[PDB]
């Protein structure tokens, strides 16, 4: 990704603050609600039928949780973002097949919900520098499907 | 937009109130940082934080919307002369609106994040995606 010193180190200190867990859950409760097509790769955690059930379902948090996790390791590792989610690239294309376009959409639920906790820390020029992260990350996790 | 949609939109859009004119400048500024392809419709733009002419553009955007929101049942015959405008004069590529409308939700999630829920979060790209509809219609 093209960033900056200066970007960079914005990036990575607001992530100091990132809770994963709330974020986290809350990000992947929203493309569920938003995008509902997306319920149909998780019907293993039980009723996402109404908003109420998703936001509080454990499996939801969870899920959530291990993804942000995931893209906190792609905020540590920004020069090697193809070698970080390799294993994963292969997970949604070959097991998963997962289209893609998904994970822009994630992506950017993500960029609200940061958004939405950070209020006006969360700068124009703070939020450019995550649409950069954001792409790094889902060109990254669709590389094992070109 | 079902019922439950519009009541969702006008809802939220009361909640917006008088801040919808700066609003849609954030959103603006928001959009030309972050994705800098679109700053080629605005040549003719001041593009500087706090410009006066993102200011303005800013404020007929945040009206548009409010005018939109008051005519939920015929979005088509509320917004035509802006379908002209940006299909057939200004050509924009259809996927700007998509960039514009993560950038209104992104502007939104900041000022309003207590009345920002999912459900409001869900009725409110709905709304946004007709509207994109409806000024891309005329090609
Ligand atoms: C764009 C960023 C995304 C990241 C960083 C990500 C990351 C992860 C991670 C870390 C796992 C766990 C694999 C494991 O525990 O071995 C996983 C599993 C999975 N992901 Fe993703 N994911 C992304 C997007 C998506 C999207 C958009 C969808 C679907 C619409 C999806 C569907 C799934 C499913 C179904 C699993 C397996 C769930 C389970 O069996 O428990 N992911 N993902
Ligand atoms: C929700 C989406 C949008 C709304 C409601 C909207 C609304 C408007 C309005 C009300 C005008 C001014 C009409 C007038 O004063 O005659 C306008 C002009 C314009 N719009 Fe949009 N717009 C939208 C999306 C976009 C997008 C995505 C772009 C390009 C990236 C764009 C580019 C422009 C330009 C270049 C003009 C002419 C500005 C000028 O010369 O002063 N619009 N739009």
Known sequence: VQLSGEEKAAVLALWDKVNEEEVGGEALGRLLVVY????????????????????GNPKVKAHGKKVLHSFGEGVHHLDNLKGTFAALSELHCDKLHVDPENFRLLGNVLVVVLARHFGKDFTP?????????????????????? | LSAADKTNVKAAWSKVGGHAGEYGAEALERMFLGFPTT???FPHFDLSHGSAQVKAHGKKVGDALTLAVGHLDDLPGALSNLSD?????????????????????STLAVHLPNDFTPAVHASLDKFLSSVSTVLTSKY
Not at chain 1, 45 to 52: A, H, K, R, V, Y
Not at chain 2, 85 to 105: I, M, Q, T, Y
């Open chain 2, 39 to 41: 700053k080629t419709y």
């Open chain 1, 125 to 146: 020029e703070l939020q450019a520098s995550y649409q950069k992260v954001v792409a790094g990350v889902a060109n990254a996790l669709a590389h094992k499907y070109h």
């Open chain 2, 85 to 105: 405008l940006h299909a057939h004069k200004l050509r924009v590529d259809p996927v700007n609106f998509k960039l514009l409308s993560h950038c209104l939700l």
């Open chain 1, 36 to 55: 509902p097509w997306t319920q149909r790769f998780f019907d293993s955690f039980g009723d996402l039928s109404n908003p109420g059930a998703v936001m």
